[PDB]
């Protein structure tokens, strides 16, 4: 799946690519599970090699945040929920070269879907590939913060269910939900931590136009402010787990009596 | 619910609003669950847009501590107990513009109720919107410190139930109380942490008249001194949980024998 | 209960107060659960308002470490054991004004009893209210260190018990007693640490007093880790015990 | 087992040692469980004392990262899996002296096996003992990162077994404990390489090309350690949830 | 028990003290559970008061690391195993005055036993009391590191026993061994931490001849490198404890069925 976008008055407008062959006019090329026809098309029409599937698995800093003849590379976890509502992180390879942004990804993602919807009726400021990359990160953080907000409200309700060792079988259900909330929070943290590394790298490495530099710092500031929330949820979750076992053992005693 | 206050010899005096239409004379407008008639009234009589309900859910720094054409915005958790005696945090949007303070909130709050009572017979120092905002934070901290104090004394009594009782009935009750104290402390910490960010932002961002600056630092100093107490309670609570499970298992053994 | 002390060759000597009315000669006024007659006596004979009972409950820095028209105020937890041998902290309001120290407290305390015993037959150095306040803190830390030392030796014996029966109920109970002592010792230390940090930045402290304060801060820094180390051991012991209890449960069911 | 390597256009080429006696031409001598005949051969043909077996057990900084008349010494944990698929760390003594690298080890290791494969058809940059040492550390980190990646995917599958019987649960706890252990041993390996590289940066004149290489490895380690810590949280939480399910099950049974 | 040592070509040589009365020639006096005859002998022949038994119990910095008319005092935990193979720490009072070292101890200790054995055929460098004190600390650290090394190998074997979660007999034994390894590690950490304070004090306080200063820093560096190992063992130990309880509960279920 190949989509391309060009700029018109600092407004991202969707290029037709099946028909309007010239890719050279695009500021952003976005690939989702691209076949070899699409890869080769980018290779020949632009200068651009793209990362292979196993290179997106690499978690080492030097494999994710690096500069080379193919441009500036940032690989970053993006958060998603699979078909059975199980949280996950999907690595996206960002590449910036000659003022063009390339995003290579394994699947559809809610941040991208959201940014694209907004980009349809919303002006960029400086109108460049670095701004675009950060806009996508802004969007990511916005969603991560929404995830955390919902862990709180779900955990609040679940908390009240757990305050009785009244078991059968709203308690099997409670432990399961706890474990689902732990896992979401855990994966949100990985996503935040990784974006944090990515942005710290960017700040030291890319000439970032100054409007872009402040934007990046703003996102870093948001991340610094979300991480503690994440850590706070783990305490609560772990305590709730402990209390539940207490109630289960109290119940066991009742039963044996 | 719209209340408005004006200043008379550095004394907040309650300006009648059903009758005395001119809002322009107020230093402080306080909204509680305001209907669209009240919102629009503030919009037209002053310049003032107010934050929407879902914008108060946002926990990201950049959504809580920011400056824009509508003025200086500080969103801050305030602590309360709901109708069924469950602790909670309620976000209050503070907005300062052209020397006037706007507080927008979802519900009655004990800090506000308390500050208003006092403000009926008590002089402000410099008599301005920044002082007023900090006075409300001072009051918040005063109450948070009282909460912590009471967690201590409650935990002290509960501690003795957990060493001296072995009935199954007074022990369900004990675990429940433990969990109620854990939750209060947890929510107090969130409240403190958030006020801390808010005040750090204020110190760097607002021209704060120097009398206000020292006031803010005093509040910051109080917070630095309350956070460790919070953390100390969690250790005790967790240890008590562990001891209880030990006693429950010792009891189980007695029963089976 | 009102006691007063005056200085004689840098030696604290106990003033008779039922009889020798002039309080003005005292360097140190010590109140224990004082009635309104004693409070008013301090109010009129010296300039001195004293903190009220509910103000000693306040834990907020700004309510404990502050300066005002009534002088320099330091509120600080002191460690004690109640009638049933249960550990506790009692807040003591220290107030320094015009070279005189005021201590207001809710109860008798071992640090004070100990300092008073010694102060009979022991010379102060610079002989002033700031030294006196720090001398009381020195004594407090001395006793806190003793408490920790004993948690160690008690925990050592208890450790061996934990490696069917009636002696295990007893073990868990003792563990929980030792946890609580250590916990309350830490609160006491942490609070004295804030108090001394405040003092260092705030009071003109005569230089002899400044080094004294730093010495106490250094002691606290060296005791806090011990406290934390005990919690690890205590928590681990608790865990092992539950393991043994479950192993026992399995033996029984078989 | 004695292997020796010399340089030819910045390409490590394997010296024949059974036959081509002169060791003096080697840039890298690599010893695996060397007998006293091999040790003595290094002692006499080069100046080189080698660390004894019990000196590789020593974990103290001053026993692992030090300089003396015998040269520059770096002892470092390398990660491996034994015959029964159990994770382990094996200390390797690196020694650099008069532009020559000596590696002394107790066993075959996957990092070395991998670096040697690659070195057969791959050019070094500056072509020296310090680069060589760092190349081996680079390779080590590459493999540690792969381990962590696999702990994640295994833990993901195991997570679902624990949410979704008595038989498949013994097995689950055992797997959990295998993953904890791997992560634990990876951390020890990372931490130790980190000390080693910090020491190197302050101590050896490191040619500037080497210096950046070392910092790159340090940067990778900084980025892998948090992953390690993150796994321990998940593992510990999974352990707790399992006990919860086991106790719920116990209650069902007793009823 | 009084032993005394003098220097001969930077070689500690054991003075005969029953017979060769002059103690003034010694660089090192070493007391083990000394009676009042030996204490008084040191008091009169040298200037030297020695710390009393209850003064070695004091753990407060100011009671362990201090200077006074009696010289330079360093009290330090040394590690040992008692008659019933239980790990322990024994405080040793080091005192340096007029170029002479005094060590006062409650019992035989493996570091001292080891240093003395080596000192019989090994030259000191600068040949002074400060070097001697540090040599003893070097030896201590050497042994602590050996302890940690052995905790690792014992914990490795024990780890494999605990994955066979089956028999009731080899499991009592396993928990016991775990608890014995936890305790050793715990006491090793106390020993390390205390030596660390002692050496930090020494570095700021004693004129330390420069050869001695580097020696001290080397020991500090070793300690900094051993502490993390200690902390790592606690995580493993705690995790193993948890897994064991899991296997015990699985077994309990099997039994009840
Ligand atoms: Mg949101
Ligand atoms: Mg636990
Ligand atoms: Mg059970
Ligand atoms: Mg209060
Ligand atoms: Mg003492
Ligand atoms: Mg050794
Ligand atoms: Mg790889």
mmCIF file of N, CA, C and O in Angstrom, chain E residues 92-129:
data_model
loop_
_atom_site.group_PDB
_atom_site.id
_atom_site.type_symbol
_atom_site.label_atom_id
_atom_site.label_comp_id
_atom_site.label_asym_id
_atom_site.label_seq_id
_atom_site.Cartn_x
_atom_site.Cartn_y
_atom_site.Cartn_z
ATOM 1 N N UNK E 92 35.641 -3.670 64.188
ATOM 2 C CA UNK E 92 37.035 -3.588 64.564
ATOM 3 C C UNK E 92 37.385 -2.128 64.687
ATOM 4 O O UNK E 92 37.119 -1.334 63.780
ATOM 5 N N UNK E 93 37.974 -1.758 65.801
ATOM 6 C CA UNK E 93 38.377 -0.373 66.000
ATOM 7 C C UNK E 93 39.810 -0.159 65.542
ATOM 8 O O UNK E 93 40.745 -0.675 66.163
ATOM 9 N N UNK E 94 39.976 0.600 64.459
ATOM 10 C CA UNK E 94 41.296 1.022 63.980
ATOM 11 C C UNK E 94 41.622 2.376 64.568
ATOM 12 O O UNK E 94 40.780 3.267 64.580
ATOM 13 N N UNK E 95 42.839 2.528 65.069
ATOM 14 C CA UNK E 95 43.288 3.800 65.658
ATOM 15 C C UNK E 95 44.721 4.087 65.233
ATOM 16 O O UNK E 95 45.600 3.231 65.368
ATOM 17 N N UNK E 96 44.942 5.274 64.683
ATOM 18 C CA UNK E 96 46.261 5.643 64.206
ATOM 19 C C UNK E 96 46.742 6.846 64.992
ATOM 20 O O UNK E 96 46.046 7.856 65.089
ATOM 21 N N UNK E 97 47.929 6.719 65.579
ATOM 22 C CA UNK E 97 48.487 7.797 66.380
ATOM 23 C C UNK E 97 49.995 7.745 66.462
ATOM 24 O O UNK E 97 50.582 6.703 66.790
ATOM 25 N N UNK E 98 50.612 8.895 66.199
ATOM 26 C CA UNK E 98 52.065 9.009 66.125
ATOM 27 C C UNK E 98 52.650 7.874 65.281
ATOM 28 O O UNK E 98 53.497 7.124 65.749
ATOM 29 N N UNK E 99 52.148 7.726 64.053
ATOM 30 C CA UNK E 99 52.674 6.750 63.080
ATOM 31 C C UNK E 99 52.482 5.270 63.401
ATOM 32 O O UNK E 99 53.002 4.414 62.681
ATOM 33 N N UNK E 100 51.732 4.975 64.467
ATOM 34 C CA UNK E 100 51.421 3.599 64.897
ATOM 35 C C UNK E 100 49.947 3.227 64.742
ATOM 36 O O UNK E 100 49.061 3.985 65.126
ATOM 37 N N UNK E 101 49.703 2.029 64.233
ATOM 38 C CA UNK E 101 48.339 1.521 64.069
ATOM 39 C C UNK E 101 47.931 0.589 65.204
ATOM 40 O O UNK E 101 48.670 -0.317 65.561
ATOM 41 N N UNK E 102 46.748 0.820 65.758
ATOM 42 C CA UNK E 102 46.176 -0.071 66.752
ATOM 43 C C UNK E 102 44.903 -0.695 66.201
ATOM 44 O O UNK E 102 43.995 0.022 65.773
ATOM 45 N N UNK E 103 44.823 -2.021 66.225
ATOM 46 C CA UNK E 103 43.577 -2.703 65.876
ATOM 47 C C UNK E 103 43.058 -3.440 67.070
ATOM 48 O O UNK E 103 43.787 -4.231 67.686
ATOM 49 N N UNK E 104 41.824 -3.123 67.442
ATOM 50 C CA UNK E 104 41.177 -3.737 68.592
ATOM 51 C C UNK E 104 39.974 -4.502 68.108
ATOM 52 O O UNK E 104 39.070 -3.920 67.502
ATOM 53 N N UNK E 105 39.949 -5.799 68.381
ATOM 54 C CA UNK E 105 38.850 -6.650 67.917
ATOM 55 C C UNK E 105 38.351 -7.697 68.923
ATOM 56 O O UNK E 105 39.026 -8.060 69.880
ATOM 57 N N UNK E 106 37.128 -8.138 68.663
ATOM 58 C CA UNK E 106 36.377 -8.999 69.560
ATOM 59 C C UNK E 106 36.672 -10.469 69.284
ATOM 60 O O UNK E 106 36.277 -11.322 70.056
ATOM 61 N N UNK E 107 37.338 -10.777 68.172
ATOM 62 C CA UNK E 107 37.485 -12.166 67.752
ATOM 63 C C UNK E 107 38.454 -12.306 66.612
ATOM 64 O O UNK E 107 38.827 -11.315 65.973
ATOM 65 N N UNK E 108 38.844 -13.548 66.340
ATOM 66 C CA UNK E 108 39.684 -13.854 65.187
ATOM 67 C C UNK E 108 38.874 -13.548 63.938
ATOM 68 O O UNK E 108 37.659 -13.680 63.939
ATOM 69 N N UNK E 109 39.548 -13.097 62.890
ATOM 70 C CA UNK E 109 38.873 -12.717 61.647
ATOM 71 C C UNK E 109 39.643 -13.183 60.421
ATOM 72 O O UNK E 109 40.861 -13.104 60.395
ATOM 73 N N UNK E 110 38.941 -13.647 59.388
ATOM 74 C CA UNK E 110 39.679 -14.225 58.277
ATOM 75 C C UNK E 110 40.552 -13.229 57.497
ATOM 76 O O UNK E 110 41.618 -13.612 57.009
ATOM 77 N N UNK E 111 40.112 -11.983 57.371
ATOM 78 C CA UNK E 111 40.947 -10.960 56.720
ATOM 79 C C UNK E 111 42.275 -10.762 57.434
ATOM 80 O O UNK E 111 43.324 -10.689 56.796
ATOM 81 N N UNK E 112 42.229 -10.672 58.756
ATOM 82 C CA UNK E 112 43.457 -10.482 59.558
ATOM 83 C C UNK E 112 44.357 -11.710 59.507
ATOM 84 O O UNK E 112 45.558 -11.606 59.312
ATOM 85 N N UNK E 113 43.748 -12.873 59.654
ATOM 86 C CA UNK E 113 44.457 -14.118 59.559
ATOM 87 C C UNK E 113 45.176 -14.221 58.209
ATOM 88 O O UNK E 113 46.333 -14.636 58.140
ATOM 89 N N UNK E 114 44.493 -13.814 57.149
ATOM 90 C CA UNK E 114 45.056 -13.834 55.818
ATOM 91 C C UNK E 114 46.142 -12.787 55.615
ATOM 92 O O UNK E 114 47.176 -13.065 54.998
ATOM 93 N N UNK E 115 45.911 -11.571 56.092
ATOM 94 C CA UNK E 115 46.903 -10.520 55.909
ATOM 95 C C UNK E 115 48.209 -10.850 56.645
ATOM 96 O O UNK E 115 49.297 -10.607 56.124
ATOM 97 N N UNK E 116 48.083 -11.393 57.849
ATOM 98 C CA UNK E 116 49.234 -11.795 58.641
ATOM 99 C C UNK E 116 50.033 -12.904 57.970
ATOM 100 O O UNK E 116 51.264 -12.868 57.951
ATOM 101 N N UNK E 117 49.342 -13.903 57.429
ATOM 102 C CA UNK E 117 50.020 -14.971 56.717
ATOM 103 C C UNK E 117 50.874 -14.398 55.560
ATOM 104 O O UNK E 117 52.082 -14.679 55.466
ATOM 105 N N UNK E 118 50.284 -13.514 54.756
ATOM 106 C CA UNK E 118 50.998 -12.859 53.638
ATOM 107 C C UNK E 118 52.124 -11.933 54.069
ATOM 108 O O UNK E 118 53.180 -11.885 53.440
ATOM 109 N N UNK E 119 51.866 -11.175 55.124
ATOM 110 C CA UNK E 119 52.825 -10.219 55.648
ATOM 111 C C UNK E 119 54.131 -10.863 56.093
ATOM 112 O O UNK E 119 55.149 -10.186 56.192
ATOM 113 N N UNK E 120 54.101 -12.160 56.390
ATOM 114 C CA UNK E 120 55.339 -12.908 56.702
ATOM 115 C C UNK E 120 56.353 -13.046 55.566
ATOM 116 O O UNK E 120 57.502 -13.387 55.810
ATOM 117 N N UNK E 121 55.956 -12.771 54.329
ATOM 118 C CA UNK E 121 56.867 -12.955 53.201
ATOM 119 C C UNK E 121 56.459 -12.014 52.086
ATOM 120 O O UNK E 121 56.249 -12.432 50.957
ATOM 121 N N UNK E 122 56.336 -10.735 52.414
ATOM 122 C CA UNK E 122 55.841 -9.760 51.457
ATOM 123 C C UNK E 122 56.156 -8.361 51.936
ATOM 124 O O UNK E 122 55.879 -8.011 53.079
ATOM 125 N N UNK E 123 56.693 -7.552 51.033
ATOM 126 C CA UNK E 123 57.131 -6.206 51.372
ATOM 127 C C UNK E 123 56.010 -5.168 51.222
ATOM 128 O O UNK E 123 55.280 -5.175 50.242
ATOM 129 N N UNK E 124 55.885 -4.279 52.202
ATOM 130 C CA UNK E 124 55.069 -3.071 52.059
ATOM 131 C C UNK E 124 55.779 -2.096 51.130
ATOM 132 O O UNK E 124 56.970 -2.241 50.872
ATOM 133 N N UNK E 125 55.053 -1.102 50.637
ATOM 134 C CA UNK E 125 55.620 -0.107 49.715
ATOM 135 C C UNK E 125 56.258 1.094 50.441
ATOM 136 O O UNK E 125 57.464 1.307 50.341
ATOM 137 N N UNK E 126 55.437 1.888 51.131
ATOM 138 C CA UNK E 126 55.892 3.118 51.804
ATOM 139 C C UNK E 126 56.183 2.775 53.257
ATOM 140 O O UNK E 126 56.832 3.525 53.966
ATOM 141 N N UNK E 127 55.609 1.667 53.716
ATOM 142 C CA UNK E 127 55.855 1.136 55.051
ATOM 143 C C UNK E 127 55.318 1.933 56.228
ATOM 144 O O UNK E 127 56.064 2.268 57.124
ATOM 145 N N UNK E 128 54.031 2.252 56.234
ATOM 146 C CA UNK E 128 53.472 3.068 57.309
ATOM 147 C C UNK E 128 52.085 2.621 57.727
ATOM 148 O O UNK E 128 51.437 1.872 57.018
ATOM 149 N N UNK E 129 51.644 3.129 58.874
ATOM 150 C CA UNK E 129 50.363 2.781 59.480
ATOM 151 C C UNK E 129 49.149 2.980 58.572
ATOM 152 O O UNK E 129 48.197 2.210 58.646
#
